Inverse folding.
């Protein structure tokens, strides 16, 4: 269990990092297209 | 322990779903403005 959940947490955290970077980029792409 | 982790795992899953939903919206809004 424990090992399995730490891996899971690690894998979810990575995927979040990528999405947070994507969100930040998209929001700026949006601000430019609209400004 | 296993509880505390399960808890993080769950909090991470929900934040991930919210972020993919936000990303799908920005891409659609950015597509819209672009063209």
């Amino acid at each position: 269990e424990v090992k399995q959940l730490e891996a899971e947490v690690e894998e979810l955290e990575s995927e979040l990092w990528h999405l947070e970077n994507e969100v930040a980029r998209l929001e700026k792409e949006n601000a430019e297209c609209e400004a | 322990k296993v509880k505390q982790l399960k808890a993080k795992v769950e909090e991470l899953k929900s934040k991930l779903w919210h972020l993919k939903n936000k990303v799908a919206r920005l891409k659609k809004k950015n597509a819209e403005c672009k063209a």
